[PDB]
Every structure is written in structure tokens, then in C-alpha cells.
Amino acid sequence: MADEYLVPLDQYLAAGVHIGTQQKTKDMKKFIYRVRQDGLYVLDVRKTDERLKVAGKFLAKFEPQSILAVSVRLYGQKPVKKFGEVTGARAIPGRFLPGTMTNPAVKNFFEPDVLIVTDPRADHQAMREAVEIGIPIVALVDTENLLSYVDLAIPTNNKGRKALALIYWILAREILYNRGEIQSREDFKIPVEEFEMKIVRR
Amino acid sequence: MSQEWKEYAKRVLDEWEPKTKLGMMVKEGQITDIHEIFRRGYQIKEPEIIDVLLPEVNARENQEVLDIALTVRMTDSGRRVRFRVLAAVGNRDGYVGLGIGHGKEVGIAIRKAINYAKLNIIEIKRGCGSWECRCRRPHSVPFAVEGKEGSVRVRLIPGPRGLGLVIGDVGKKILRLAGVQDVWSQTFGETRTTVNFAKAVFNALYNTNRVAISPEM
Amino acid sequence: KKYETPPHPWIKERLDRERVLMDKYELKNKKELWKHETQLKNFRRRARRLLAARGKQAEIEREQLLARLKRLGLLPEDAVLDDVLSLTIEDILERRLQTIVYKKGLARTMRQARQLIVHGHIEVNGQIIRSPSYLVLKEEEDTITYARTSPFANPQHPERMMIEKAKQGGEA
Amino acid sequence: MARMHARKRGKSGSKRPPRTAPPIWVEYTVEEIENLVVKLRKEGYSTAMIGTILRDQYGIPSVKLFKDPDNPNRNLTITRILEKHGLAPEIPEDLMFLIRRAVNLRKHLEQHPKDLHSMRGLQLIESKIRRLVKYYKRKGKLPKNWRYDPETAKLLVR
Amino acid sequence: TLLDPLANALSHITNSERVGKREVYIKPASKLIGEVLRVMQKYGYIGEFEFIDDGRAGVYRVQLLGRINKAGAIKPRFPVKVSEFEKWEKRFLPAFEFGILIVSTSQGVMSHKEAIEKGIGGRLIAYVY
RNA sequence: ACCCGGGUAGUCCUGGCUGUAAAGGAUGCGGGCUAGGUGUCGGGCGAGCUUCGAGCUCGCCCGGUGCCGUAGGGAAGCCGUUAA
RNA sequence: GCCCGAGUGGUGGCCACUAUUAUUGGGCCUAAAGCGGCCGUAGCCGGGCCCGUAAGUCCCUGGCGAAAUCCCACGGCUCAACCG
């Protein structure tokens, strides 16, 4: 898809999207940019621009609002909540409240069209039910996370707040570009800070 | 029986309230083609979706119960018996769903099972071609297939017209509910276990479509 | 030999078919039914084995087995070894002497017919017969009659009256 | 690739140059090569090590590729260069090195006999010889009248 | 050692298939396999192959369409008359349609169906369907 | 008898005999093919560090030695590139 | 009341069922069952590439494997068995 300008190249690189952690596995090896002299893996920044574009498309497509962004992360649940406010659909739970998809007796029952997971390793349940219902699945995947069952990717960092902020932000921008309200080439009406998290009292 | 057909489907369509998107589009009369539910792999979550396709009249949804079992769990100062049952939904016309169900009472289980079975419906592709010439109808399966369930190994084999369903009775019930007229049956490994043997035949008739052949091309 | 009994004789589904058949054609014993099943089996078995083998093997073998079925009448004007397998134990039973006597209107009903051929009240060709099995060819159908008989030597045998009240032939 | 023989251990993966015709940035004549070989067999080195030193010094990985074609019956290589001159040992080096070693063992055992392991490799080296003998007989480097034994190993070495 | 190098080709090729890789690599290579892949390609089962002959060995890189279900060598490699074909027809193959019981023959190498049209037979080599 | 206090054969060495085991991984051997991850031992390689020694670490590779697990197999436990 | 019917049943033998003898078509971690491990003789089984023979192997022809029984047709005996 399209060449990495700035906003695109300064945004990901300024936000700690690049910095991935320990472990590589054979399937992920393709998005993996480089080795540091420590086991800390760096992701390709081009591939993130690329795999964010088609993800405006793929989610501008399912235009009815039953896209579900769930998170098991404490960090991530704030960016997600804010992301969902903009778009128009979200399932909130710390878990999935299993029987979101598979059961309609549950008082909280949705019937999605797409999902976004944050960590394939924590949100495995949301995946577990994503194989049965017949739902296509777009996400954020780390140097540690596989792509088994994970059919479309967005290889980005998800372990930190700045990043966890930037992405559910730029994405909230991109799908609003495609569907035709506020563009991904105009500066977003919403500030990044709300998606950014902070600990004053717990 | 004629028009009374849709009338059961429309009587179900009086108070049937869709849980799913699948149950909705069907209840709207859209994609009125069971086959057009299968190809796509859209989840059969509602029982009634099917009751929508199979009226009183033409295909005749032959509901049938194979085995009813009584099992126990031992509990404090108690034996808690229940029942398991195996039921077969199918049209002679080339669909089938095998169901089993477990329950305390008998009647319920029958009911459970009848429902269970609906979800797990399957097309059996029959042998248009036949064995020898595609003279008229699909008498058989296209290709010999085998089932695998615990110890049980069932081969279905193409066949001559009129040489009809040459298998053990248990399967013979299921097959008839499929719509295979003619088929050589080569079993191997304990069938005593009905549930499986059945699961075998079902799996088998299931795998029909899973075979990838040349005439598809 | 000349019979068959399936692996398990007391099976209900097999037994039901027969007893319904047993009244329908009015057999005297089950063995008779069996005769025709076992006869049917052989044609099928052979028809099938012939079609299967390499097409170069003297085709005469096929011709021959299609010739007889035509002559007998089971097969009308169809050209495939696959229609043969599309016969059933009912079709053979339609082909019997007994059946064909009731059909033409020589007898009131098949139960009556059982009486007639035994005492020699049905002639075929120039011969009488005693065996109600008797396989009746298509060419052979046209030559069933009376001549030196209790049904037809006059016009005041009550026999004539018994056949007239019904007047219905057809599958037995 | 491997064969764990008298072992469980996968064999070295050492692998040949996939060169099929020879380097020309390396340069030697059929005459020059032949000299180098004869000089080294004159030292007391043996054909594997002769091919080794030529590789490490003169930069020829295998002789066959460089030499043939110069009489294209077959590939021309070290010992086939030697036999045409008469410098070849009538025993193949393979079989020789083997037997050579073997006679040394026996002397150890002679003085030291309480040795399982050392005893057990006597048994493991003979039986490679046996084989190596067996087939050669039929190929013809060693006459059919021969048979192998530890007095007929102490006579070939001396 | 190896023996039946063909078979160790084929068997890869199928276990290759069953995974649903894209293309194959078969390290040992030959006429048998070469020829057999040739006949295989001729019927169409496979896409294109290149062999590279390394000074070590032939290697075949093979392209996988998706067609193949199962294709295997024969164990003692039995001799089979042209009358006995039908027996060996019913056994090994999945139905009358397929017809690559690949045999080796007087004419060359063929499938089952290409053998029957000529009319000639022999010892079995492998199968494909 | 378990527990305690004495005690011979034996336990050790040399030469010989004997040849058994839940002698197990209850898993004969050889070749090829079939997601991966991680720890570890030894060998190779490209670097950074250095006490200038591969001493401390990162990654690919080769050989071995564990654990976890996809597809598949299994009756299940489990096995799963050290195959069952 | 069900079966069968001038038969029907009892004991014994053989074959099937019994892929419980595995060629077709079985297993062997824990169900029976891996030899405690290795060596190599007899045997079986064998990388690629070219040429000869054509022993196996396939194809064709030709000599020949009695009659009977079997299978199919037609014909004969009222019918079939049985026979031609």
C-alpha cells in the first residue's frame, strides 16, 4: 500500500511501536525488522503503516456497528474504551464474559461483525469463540504472539500506554477517513491524551 | 400434502424471534436455500432455521431415535440415573443431522437430542454419475469413504442400482435418512458401541463433501 | 441349490415385507417367495459382473442375459445392464403363472386361481400344468385358454359366473 | 546424511563444493599438477593428506574437476595419477590405514589385559576390515585366496 | 540406508500435500521419480517442477496445485497381468474415474488409464489419486 | 519382624565360572518426509563487552541432552522433529 | 401367539462370522506381546547415470491341461430337478 510519509513514519517511531520484547517464532519472522544486541526485537515500521491502511479498509467495510474491541490489559482498557466511543460499538469486559457470541441467553449478548484483540496471549478466549461463530479477526500482534487463527494482522507494540494510545487513535482516524467523516490525512479532532492512561489513585 | 407445507413453517414464523443474524435472514425468507447456508459455513445456532426449510409435505423430516441408554453417577447416599439418547434427523432427499443427548428424564432427552441433531445437519453429496453410467439419479455416494470413531472403521462403497444399503441396521437407519439408496458397507472394529458406529456413519457421510475430486476440477 | 435365507431369519424388517407380500400374491409357503429372490439375485449378480469387466470380453455374454429378460418380459425395451438391477421381488412375482391367470380375467381372484391349474382348469399352449410357479414368457402370454375343461365346455358352469362378477386383472 | 554407527550421534555435515567445472582464477597445467602430486607422495604423506595440502596451498578443491578432461575415460585424481607411474600401494589406503592402526591396539592389550573398552574396539575395527576386505576381493585389489586374521594382519604391516 | 528413493520422494510429496505447503524439495532425485513426476504432470496432478542437478544430487522443486489426495509406491512391486488389472483396479484406486495406478511397461511408463488404452502391462511401480 | 545390642558367609583384591533383572524410556534397528517455543551441554560463525582468556552476553547454524505444545495418532493417560 | 412347514429339532464335525492367523487384511509404552545390547554369516531388501543381453516381466502366435461338475444361451421331458 502507500509510501511512509510523516505523519505516518514520525508517529510510529516517536511512540515506542518499534520496541518489541523477548522470543521470536518462525511465522512472525516476516514483520521483524531487526535484532538488538540484547534479545529486544525491533518491528519493521513500514509494515505497520502498510498493515494499518488495509485495516481502515477492512473495518470501513463492516459499516454496521458491531465491531468489538475487548482487552484483558489494564493499560489497554482505557485506549479501547475511548476508541469505542468514537467508532460506535464495543464490548467492554476485563474478560469476554464468555457466551458473548456462543450464547444468547446471556443478558449481555451481542452479535459482532468484527473483533479487535490487543494481546492474542491474554484474549485467547475471544479468539476461542471467534473460530466457532465464523468471525474474521484483526488485531495487534507482538514478537511473542503467534498468528494461528489470526488471519489479518497489524504488527505493532501493545505492551505500553503511548503505543496503546497511538494505535487505537490512528485507527479511530483511519476508519473515519474511509467511511468519510474525518480523514487520516487531516489532523484528528480528538486529542491523543484520553487514550493515554494515568495512575493517580487505584 | 401441497401448501400445508409452508403453513407449518409460517406457523413457526408466527412466534419465532431470532437470536442470530442467521435466524433473522432465514426468518425474512432470504437465502431460502439450505444449501446456501452450508457452502458459506454460517453457524446453525437456531433450531428453527431448519424447521423453516423442512415443511410437512415434500422431503418429510424423518425424525428417528436409535438408542436410549441409562447411565448413573454415584452420589452421596444416592445413585443418580439419567438417560442418553441418539436421534437422527434426515430427509431421504440428501440432508442429515445426527444427534445425541443426555438428561435425567427420558422424554426431555428425546427432545434435547431432537434439537441437538438439527444444529449438526449435513449435506451428503450423492453419486450423480452412479457407479457405471450417470443414467439418472444419484443412487450412491460418489466415492468410497471411510469413517473413524474410537475403534470403528466404516467403508462406504459405490454400488449397483438396487443393491440397497448393505450395512448393519444401525447405520442402515441413518443412511436411509441420508438418501443413499445403494452402498456396500465394510465395517471394522467394535460396533457394539452404537453411539460411535453411528458417529462413524455420520462422520463418513459428512466427509463426502470433504473429498476433493476431478469432475469438480 | 435353490433358496436363500438372510444371515438372521427372525429379523422384523425382513419378515414384515414378506407377510405383506405373502397375502398380496397369495403364496402357500415362504420358500416360493424365496425362489424368486434367489432367482433375481443371480441375474443381478451376473449382470453386474459383466458390465464391470474389460469391454473386449466376448459381449455375447451380455447380449445373452439381456435376451432372456426381454423374452421373459421383465425387461421391456431398455438397453442397460443397470435397469436389470432396477428389478424387485415384486416384478418377478408379477411374472408367475398364478399372477398372469388372474390378470387376463381367466380367474376371479388369485386364491381361486390356485384351485384351477391344479385340477387342470387352465390350459397353456396345448399342455395343462400343475406348477403355479411356472414362468410365463411374453410370447407365452397370448396362449392361455380352455378346451376339454370344467370352466369352458358349455355356457352354464357357475364357474363362468364367479369370474364375471369381479372382472379385474392387474398386478397381484 | 548421518549414520550413527557404533553411536547414536548424527554425523558431520561437511559438504563439497557444488563446482562442477574448476576455477580458472586458480591456474595449473596437467603437467604442473602431476608434479605436485608426485612430490608429496615422495614425502611419505598419503592421498587424503595429499589432496589436503594441495587444497590448502595450491588452491585446488579436488583433482578430478581440474584434470579430467585430459583422457576422458574417467576422472583423473591423485591415486589414478600415482598408478600410471607405479607409486600406488597395491593395498588400498582405505584398507591400509585401517589395518595399520589395528596392530597397535593389540600391543596395548598385550600388556594391559583388563580392558573392556579397549578390547571392544578391537572387535569394532576388525569387523570393518572384514567388510572392506570382502568386497575388495570381488572388485580385485586383494586376491581371493586371502583370508583375514591377526597373524595375517601382523605380516602385512611388517 | 535408503531404498525405494522414489517412495521417499512420493511419501514426502503426499505428506507435503497434507500440510498444504506451496512447493516441495526432494533431495534425492532420479529417473524413477523424474519420469514419474513427468507422467504425473502429464495427467496434471502437479504444477511445474525444476530439478537442479548438483554435483551431489538431482533435487526436484515441485509446485503443488492442491489436486493430490494420495499417491504411493508398491511394496514388493508385484507383476500384474492385463487381466489381473481390474482386481488391482478395485483395490488400490478410489474409483473407476481416477486411473493412475502407475505401472511400468514395455512401451515405457504410463498411468493405469494410459496403460489400458494401449493394452500392455507388468510389474507395478506406484499409485496416484 | 519392624526398633536396639552383638555376628559368619559376603561386601575389597587377583584369576576363573555363573548369565539373571521393573537389564525401562515397560518404546529393535536404518533412511526420508511432517507448526513451533523454550532451557541446557559441546563445536562453528557475525558482534558488543574484556580481566585481552570466547571471560560476559545477543543470534544463526551443527551434534547431543530436557521440558512445553500445532497438525496428526491414541481407548484414554499421553505421544507429538529425541513419534507412539 | 410367532416361525417354518413334510418337515422341524438334538448331539457331533467342518467353514463362515473371526482383519481370533492379518496376501487382501492384526498387533506388540501402560491391554498378550521388544530379545538386557551388539556383531556379522545364510537370507531378504538397495542412490544416480550410459551401454549389452532379454533370465524374471509384459505382448502375440502356436502345442496342451479328458469327460463330467460349475456359469450363460437355446432345445427336450407337463414343470423343474435332470438331460441334449
mmCIF file of N, CA, C and O (backbone and C1' of nucleotides) in Angstrom, chain C residues 2 10 15 18-19 29-31 34 46 56 64-65 68 71 127-131 134, chain G residues 2-9 59-60 71-81:
data_model
loop_
_atom_site.group_PDB
_atom_site.id
_atom_site.type_symbol
_atom_site.label_atom_id
_atom_site.label_comp_id
_atom_site.label_asym_id
_atom_site.label_seq_id
_atom_site.Cartn_x
_atom_site.Cartn_y
_atom_site.Cartn_z
ATOM 1 N N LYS C 2 -31.393 -73.854 -4.416
ATOM 2 C CA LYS C 2 -32.463 -73.059 -4.964
ATOM 3 C C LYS C 2 -33.193 -72.199 -3.927
ATOM 4 O O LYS C 2 -34.366 -71.908 -4.100
ATOM 5 N N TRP C 10 -35.099 -64.221 11.866
ATOM 6 C CA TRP C 10 -36.240 -63.630 12.588
ATOM 7 C C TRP C 10 -36.321 -62.128 12.506
ATOM 8 O O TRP C 10 -37.124 -61.539 13.228
ATOM 9 N N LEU C 15 -39.122 -59.729 7.811
ATOM 10 C CA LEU C 15 -40.337 -60.510 7.951
ATOM 11 C C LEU C 15 -41.588 -59.755 7.583
ATOM 12 O O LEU C 15 -42.514 -60.351 7.060
ATOM 13 N N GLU C 18 -42.303 -59.670 3.688
ATOM 14 C CA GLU C 18 -42.790 -60.974 3.242
ATOM 15 C C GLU C 18 -44.294 -61.142 3.469
ATOM 16 O O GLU C 18 -45.014 -61.456 2.542
ATOM 17 N N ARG C 19 -44.760 -60.892 4.693
ATOM 18 C CA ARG C 19 -46.140 -61.199 5.132
ATOM 19 C C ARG C 19 -47.130 -60.330 4.402
ATOM 20 O O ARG C 19 -48.276 -60.714 4.190
ATOM 21 N N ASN C 29 -46.287 -71.182 0.717
ATOM 22 C CA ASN C 29 -45.145 -71.136 1.633
ATOM 23 C C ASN C 29 -44.151 -69.992 1.278
ATOM 24 O O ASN C 29 -44.229 -69.398 0.197
ATOM 25 N N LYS C 30 -43.224 -69.697 2.193
ATOM 26 C CA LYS C 30 -42.245 -68.612 2.035
ATOM 27 C C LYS C 30 -41.191 -68.969 1.029
ATOM 28 O O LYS C 30 -40.684 -68.116 0.303
ATOM 29 N N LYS C 31 -40.851 -70.251 1.020
ATOM 30 C CA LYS C 31 -39.939 -70.831 0.035
ATOM 31 C C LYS C 31 -40.184 -70.316 -1.368
ATOM 32 O O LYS C 31 -39.241 -70.077 -2.108
ATOM 33 N N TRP C 34 -38.944 -66.992 -1.757
ATOM 34 C CA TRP C 34 -37.500 -67.150 -1.799
ATOM 35 C C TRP C 34 -37.024 -67.522 -3.199
ATOM 36 O O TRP C 34 -36.042 -66.943 -3.689
ATOM 37 N N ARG C 46 -24.894 -61.437 -11.998
ATOM 38 C CA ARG C 46 -24.185 -61.697 -13.270
ATOM 39 C C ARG C 46 -24.156 -60.434 -14.123
ATOM 40 O O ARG C 46 -23.109 -60.044 -14.632
ATOM 41 N N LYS C 56 -13.821 -55.647 -23.938
ATOM 42 C CA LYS C 56 -13.455 -56.548 -25.052
ATOM 43 C C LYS C 56 -13.882 -58.029 -24.911
ATOM 44 O O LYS C 56 -13.890 -58.761 -25.910
ATOM 45 N N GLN C 64 -26.708 -62.218 -24.293
ATOM 46 C CA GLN C 64 -27.436 -63.387 -23.846
ATOM 47 C C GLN C 64 -28.297 -63.073 -22.640
ATOM 48 O O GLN C 64 -29.477 -63.406 -22.651
ATOM 49 N N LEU C 65 -27.741 -62.399 -21.629
ATOM 50 C CA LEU C 65 -28.527 -62.127 -20.390
ATOM 51 C C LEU C 65 -29.575 -61.003 -20.590
ATOM 52 O O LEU C 65 -30.481 -60.851 -19.759
ATOM 53 N N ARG C 68 -32.836 -63.099 -22.716
ATOM 54 C CA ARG C 68 -33.738 -63.848 -21.801
ATOM 55 C C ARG C 68 -34.721 -62.958 -21.001
ATOM 56 O O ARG C 68 -35.900 -63.301 -20.884
ATOM 57 N N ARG C 71 -37.354 -61.680 -23.296
ATOM 58 C CA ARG C 71 -38.227 -62.777 -23.690
ATOM 59 C C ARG C 71 -39.183 -63.151 -22.589
ATOM 60 O O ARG C 71 -40.347 -63.466 -22.829
ATOM 61 N N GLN C 127 -50.783 -77.847 -23.463
ATOM 62 C CA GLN C 127 -50.444 -78.657 -22.353
ATOM 63 C C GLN C 127 -51.267 -78.063 -21.250
ATOM 64 O O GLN C 127 -51.649 -76.916 -21.281
ATOM 65 N N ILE C 128 -51.577 -78.890 -20.288
ATOM 66 C CA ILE C 128 -52.053 -78.453 -18.994
ATOM 67 C C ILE C 128 -50.795 -78.188 -18.168
ATOM 68 O O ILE C 128 -49.699 -78.429 -18.647
ATOM 69 N N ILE C 129 -50.936 -77.640 -16.961
ATOM 70 C CA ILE C 129 -49.824 -77.591 -15.985
ATOM 71 C C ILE C 129 -50.317 -77.715 -14.547
ATOM 72 O O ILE C 129 -51.466 -77.409 -14.251
ATOM 73 N N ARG C 130 -49.400 -78.119 -13.668
ATOM 74 C CA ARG C 130 -49.648 -78.371 -12.221
ATOM 75 C C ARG C 130 -48.905 -77.414 -11.238
ATOM 76 O O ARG C 130 -49.197 -77.386 -10.029
ATOM 77 N N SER C 131 -47.978 -76.621 -11.776
ATOM 78 C CA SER C 131 -46.981 -75.884 -11.015
ATOM 79 C C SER C 131 -47.274 -74.405 -11.228
ATOM 80 O O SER C 131 -47.087 -73.888 -12.322
ATOM 81 N N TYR C 134 -44.908 -71.524 -12.505
ATOM 82 C CA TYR C 134 -44.490 -71.569 -13.935
ATOM 83 C C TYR C 134 -44.258 -70.181 -14.545
ATOM 84 O O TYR C 134 -45.126 -69.300 -14.512
ATOM 85 P P C G 2 -49.711 -64.596 15.395
ATOM 86 O "O5'" C G 2 -48.155 -64.929 15.529
ATOM 87 C "C5'" C G 2 -47.171 -63.878 15.658
ATOM 88 C "C4'" C G 2 -45.745 -64.399 15.628
ATOM 89 C "C3'" C G 2 -45.354 -65.297 14.471
ATOM 90 O "O3'" C G 2 -45.139 -64.619 13.252
ATOM 91 C "C1'" C G 2 -44.547 -66.266 16.427
ATOM 92 P P C G 3 -45.249 -65.437 11.905
ATOM 93 O "O5'" C G 3 -43.967 -66.377 11.962
ATOM 94 C "C5'" C G 3 -42.641 -65.823 12.007
ATOM 95 C "C4'" C G 3 -41.616 -66.923 12.069
ATOM 96 C "C3'" C G 3 -41.710 -67.940 10.950
ATOM 97 O "O3'" C G 3 -40.961 -67.487 9.847
ATOM 98 C "C1'" C G 3 -41.536 -69.067 12.998
ATOM 99 P P C G 4 -41.514 -67.716 8.409
ATOM 100 O "O5'" C G 4 -41.254 -69.260 8.176
ATOM 101 C "C5'" C G 4 -39.924 -69.742 8.033
ATOM 102 C "C4'" C G 4 -39.946 -71.212 8.295
ATOM 103 C "C3'" C G 4 -40.761 -72.034 7.315
ATOM 104 O "O3'" C G 4 -40.161 -72.273 6.056
ATOM 105 C "C1'" C G 4 -41.282 -72.708 9.494
ATOM 106 P P G G 5 -41.096 -72.589 4.808
ATOM 107 O "O5'" G G 5 -41.738 -73.992 5.190
ATOM 108 C "C5'" G G 5 -40.952 -75.192 5.244
ATOM 109 C "C4'" G G 5 -41.821 -76.300 5.760
ATOM 110 C "C3'" G G 5 -43.016 -76.574 4.879
ATOM 111 O "O3'" G G 5 -42.602 -77.464 3.878
ATOM 112 C "C1'" G G 5 -43.709 -76.427 7.140
ATOM 113 P P A G 6 -43.623 -77.881 2.767
ATOM 114 O "O5'" A G 6 -44.079 -79.331 3.246
ATOM 115 C "C5'" A G 6 -43.477 -80.551 2.734
ATOM 116 C "C4'" A G 6 -42.683 -81.245 3.821
ATOM 117 C "C3'" A G 6 -42.123 -82.644 3.502
ATOM 118 O "O3'" A G 6 -40.828 -82.891 4.054
ATOM 119 C "C1'" A G 6 -43.388 -82.719 5.476
ATOM 120 P P G G 7 -39.487 -82.438 3.298
ATOM 121 O "O5'" G G 7 -39.328 -80.918 3.760
ATOM 122 C "C5'" G G 7 -38.685 -80.540 5.004
ATOM 123 C "C4'" G G 7 -39.693 -80.033 6.016
ATOM 124 C "C3'" G G 7 -39.105 -79.440 7.291
ATOM 125 O "O3'" G G 7 -39.191 -78.025 7.182
ATOM 126 C "C1'" G G 7 -40.602 -81.214 7.828
ATOM 127 P P U G 8 -38.065 -77.112 7.793
ATOM 128 O "O5'" U G 8 -38.134 -77.445 9.342
ATOM 129 C "C5'" U G 8 -38.955 -76.655 10.189
ATOM 130 C "C4'" U G 8 -39.053 -77.336 11.511
ATOM 131 C "C3'" U G 8 -37.808 -77.269 12.363
ATOM 132 O "O3'" U G 8 -37.736 -76.024 13.024
ATOM 133 C "C1'" U G 8 -38.673 -79.454 12.412
ATOM 134 P P G G 9 -36.353 -75.541 13.618
ATOM 135 O "O5'" G G 9 -35.923 -76.744 14.582
ATOM 136 C "C5'" G G 9 -35.781 -76.547 16.016
ATOM 137 C "C4'" G G 9 -35.559 -77.843 16.780
ATOM 138 C "C3'" G G 9 -34.120 -78.214 17.095
ATOM 139 O "O3'" G G 9 -33.608 -77.543 18.236
ATOM 140 C "C1'" G G 9 -35.328 -80.132 16.384
ATOM 141 P P C G 59 0.028 -59.208 -20.767
ATOM 142 O "O5'" C G 59 0.557 -58.964 -22.247
ATOM 143 C "C5'" C G 59 0.149 -57.795 -22.965
ATOM 144 C "C4'" C G 59 0.667 -57.829 -24.380
ATOM 145 C "C3'" C G 59 0.183 -58.973 -25.251
ATOM 146 O "O3'" C G 59 -1.146 -58.738 -25.709
ATOM 147 C "C1'" C G 59 2.503 -58.600 -25.603
ATOM 148 P P C G 60 -2.102 -59.969 -26.063
ATOM 149 O "O5'" C G 60 -1.379 -60.622 -27.323
ATOM 150 C "C5'" C G 60 -1.487 -60.014 -28.620
ATOM 151 C "C4'" C G 60 -0.750 -60.834 -29.647
ATOM 152 C "C3'" C G 60 -1.120 -62.304 -29.718
ATOM 153 O "O3'" C G 60 -2.338 -62.508 -30.410
ATOM 154 C "C1'" C G 60 1.221 -62.055 -29.891
ATOM 155 P P C G 71 -24.492 -73.495 -11.803
ATOM 156 O "O5'" C G 71 -23.963 -72.335 -12.750
ATOM 157 C "C5'" C G 71 -23.405 -71.141 -12.191
ATOM 158 C "C4'" C G 71 -22.905 -70.247 -13.294
ATOM 159 C "C3'" C G 71 -23.855 -70.022 -14.456
ATOM 160 O "O3'" C G 71 -24.868 -69.082 -14.129
ATOM 161 C "C1'" C G 71 -21.694 -70.437 -15.284
ATOM 162 P P C G 72 -26.373 -69.310 -14.647
ATOM 163 O "O5'" C G 72 -26.276 -68.952 -16.188
ATOM 164 C "C5'" C G 72 -25.917 -67.623 -16.513
ATOM 165 C "C4'" C G 72 -25.745 -67.473 -17.986
ATOM 166 C "C3'" C G 72 -26.776 -68.116 -18.880
ATOM 167 O "O3'" C G 72 -27.975 -67.365 -18.844
ATOM 168 C "C1'" C G 72 -24.630 -68.483 -19.772
ATOM 169 P P A G 73 -29.351 -68.082 -19.140
ATOM 170 O "O5'" A G 73 -29.264 -68.384 -20.703
ATOM 171 C "C5'" A G 73 -29.275 -67.296 -21.652
ATOM 172 C "C4'" A G 73 -29.012 -67.758 -23.072
ATOM 173 C "C3'" A G 73 -30.011 -68.728 -23.687
ATOM 174 O "O3'" A G 73 -31.087 -67.986 -24.223
ATOM 175 C "C1'" A G 73 -27.826 -69.459 -24.167
ATOM 176 P P C G 74 -32.555 -68.483 -24.011
ATOM 177 O "O5'" C G 74 -32.696 -69.632 -25.092
ATOM 178 C "C5'" C G 74 -32.675 -69.304 -26.480
ATOM 179 C "C4'" C G 74 -32.383 -70.541 -27.271
ATOM 180 C "C3'" C G 74 -33.347 -71.702 -27.097
ATOM 181 O "O3'" C G 74 -34.496 -71.596 -27.920
ATOM 182 C "C1'" C G 74 -31.136 -72.489 -26.973
ATOM 183 P P G G 75 -35.768 -72.505 -27.614
ATOM 184 O "O5'" G G 75 -35.215 -73.986 -27.778
ATOM 185 C "C5'" G G 75 -35.435 -74.738 -28.973
ATOM 186 C "C4'" G G 75 -34.960 -76.134 -28.718
ATOM 187 C "C3'" G G 75 -35.885 -76.968 -27.859
ATOM 188 O "O3'" G G 75 -36.976 -77.469 -28.620
ATOM 189 C "C1'" G G 75 -33.644 -77.246 -27.136
ATOM 190 P P G G 76 -38.296 -77.979 -27.882
ATOM 191 O "O5'" G G 76 -37.777 -79.221 -27.028
ATOM 192 C "C5'" G G 76 -37.517 -80.494 -27.654
ATOM 193 C "C4'" G G 76 -37.230 -81.572 -26.633
ATOM 194 C "C3'" G G 76 -38.217 -81.687 -25.489
ATOM 195 O "O3'" G G 76 -39.420 -82.269 -25.956
ATOM 196 C "C1'" G G 76 -36.031 -81.937 -24.656
ATOM 197 P P C G 77 -40.770 -82.029 -25.156
ATOM 198 O "O5'" C G 77 -40.545 -82.895 -23.841
ATOM 199 C "C5'" C G 77 -40.577 -84.327 -23.897
ATOM 200 C "C4'" C G 77 -40.314 -84.869 -22.528
ATOM 201 C "C3'" C G 77 -41.244 -84.339 -21.463
ATOM 202 O "O3'" C G 77 -42.469 -85.032 -21.514
ATOM 203 C "C1'" C G 77 -39.020 -84.295 -20.678
ATOM 204 P P U G 78 -43.584 -84.677 -20.465
ATOM 205 O "O5'" U G 78 -43.613 -83.089 -20.493
ATOM 206 C "C5'" U G 78 -44.533 -82.397 -21.341
ATOM 207 C "C4'" U G 78 -45.355 -81.428 -20.538
ATOM 208 C "C3'" U G 78 -44.566 -80.445 -19.699
ATOM 209 O "O3'" U G 78 -44.082 -79.399 -20.518
ATOM 210 C "C1'" U G 78 -46.448 -81.228 -18.494
ATOM 211 P P C G 79 -42.548 -79.067 -20.503
ATOM 212 O "O5'" C G 79 -42.328 -78.599 -18.995
ATOM 213 C "C5'" C G 79 -42.997 -77.423 -18.510
ATOM 214 C "C4'" C G 79 -42.796 -77.228 -17.024
ATOM 215 C "C3'" C G 79 -41.371 -77.080 -16.513
ATOM 216 O "O3'" C G 79 -40.815 -75.789 -16.804
ATOM 217 C "C1'" C G 79 -42.772 -78.247 -14.952
ATOM 218 P P A G 80 -39.282 -75.620 -17.316
ATOM 219 O "O5'" A G 80 -38.435 -76.291 -16.141
ATOM 220 C "C5'" A G 80 -37.510 -75.537 -15.323
ATOM 221 C "C4'" A G 80 -37.368 -76.151 -13.945
ATOM 222 C "C3'" A G 80 -36.161 -77.058 -13.721
ATOM 223 O "O3'" A G 80 -34.986 -76.289 -13.472
ATOM 224 C "C1'" A G 80 -38.099 -78.080 -12.828
ATOM 225 P P A G 81 -33.563 -76.815 -13.959
ATOM 226 O "O5'" A G 81 -33.317 -78.062 -13.005
ATOM 227 C "C5'" A G 81 -33.072 -77.837 -11.616
ATOM 228 C "C4'" A G 81 -33.281 -79.101 -10.825
ATOM 229 C "C3'" A G 81 -32.429 -80.299 -11.218
ATOM 230 O "O3'" A G 81 -31.110 -80.329 -10.716
ATOM 231 C "C1'" A G 81 -34.631 -81.018 -10.972
#
